[PDB]
């Protein structure tokens, strides 16, 4: 494993909020789909993915 460039680009707060939000969809991790429901197993990715979102939306 090699790092080609630690800082390749800034992801704006919004861009993150989006990407992480659209991500929870592909894997069914949204308020809506969570209550209407195996979704993607990954507990850690799902884990932090939610927290980052709950942060930028506050």
């Amino acid at each position: 494993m090699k790092v080609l460039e630690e800082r390749n680009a800034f992801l704006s707060d919004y861009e993150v909020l989006k990407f992480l939000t659209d991500l929870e969809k592909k894997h069914l991790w949204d308020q809506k789909s969570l209550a209407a429901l195996r979704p993607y197993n990954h507990p850690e990715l799902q884990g932090i993915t939610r927290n980052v979102v709950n942060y930028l939306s506050i």
């Binding site: 494993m1 090699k2 790092v3 080609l4 460039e5 630690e6 800082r7 390749n8 680009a9 800034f10 992801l11 707060d13 993150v16 990407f19 992480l20 991500l23 990954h42 850690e44 990715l45 884990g47 932090i48 993915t49 939610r50 927290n51 980052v52 709950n54 942060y55």
Partner: protein, 179 residues
């Protein structure tokens, strides 16, 4: 506060998955190794933003799994030097304040040599006080605005990645103090 990091690495895809979207499979293996995990001397990796390049899968003579060299980018939590970050006071130790980005990162420490000139600790109330003529209290669980000062890495308490913060300028400190 967030960035992307161009990285390269070898992945191992099991025969049990050769029928899956090869690339979606790769991404899985990466999150498997990096999602919410630290990247040595870089920072906290949140997930893969995208894949950039993939080679051909070379098989091993011992197990039907093909190995693949991949170049990708990843969403990394790596506040920059000078940035003004907002978090919650998680603990007031006699030597400083510990901050948190609620579930994101807990290794944010603001030491006494970083607070306002005069700040002292109180083991009775369990908090740090700030004088100016008139006592202001950095209390537990209150949003804190702090400036990031040092980026501390350690090849691997102690944590492989931590950050030092400050509160020495108008506006920094407990948020309820300047809104």
């Amino acid at each position: 506060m967030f960035i992307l990091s161009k990285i390269a690495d070898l992945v191992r895809i099991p025969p049990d998955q050769f029928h899956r979207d090869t690339i979606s499979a790769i991404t899985h293996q990466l999150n498997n190794k990096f999602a919410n995990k630290i990247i040595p001397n870089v920072g906290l990796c949140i997930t893969i933003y995208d894949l950039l390049t993939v080679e051909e899968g070379q098989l091993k003579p011992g197990d039907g799994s093909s190995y693949i060299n991949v170049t990708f980018r990843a969403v990394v939590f790596k506040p920059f030097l000078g940035e003004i970050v907002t978090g919650w006071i998680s603990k007031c130790t006699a030597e400083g304040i510990k901050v948190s980005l609620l579930g994101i990162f807990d290794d944010i420490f603001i030491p006494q040599n970083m607070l306002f000139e005069g700040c002292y600790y109180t083991p009775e109330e369990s908090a740090w006080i700030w004088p100016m003529d008139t006592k202001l209290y950095f209390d537990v669980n209150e949003k804190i605005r702090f400036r990031i000062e040092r980026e501390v890495f350690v090849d691997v308490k102690p944590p492989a990645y931590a950050l030092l913060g400050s509160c020495q300028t108008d506006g920094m400190g407990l948020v309820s103090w300047w809104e």
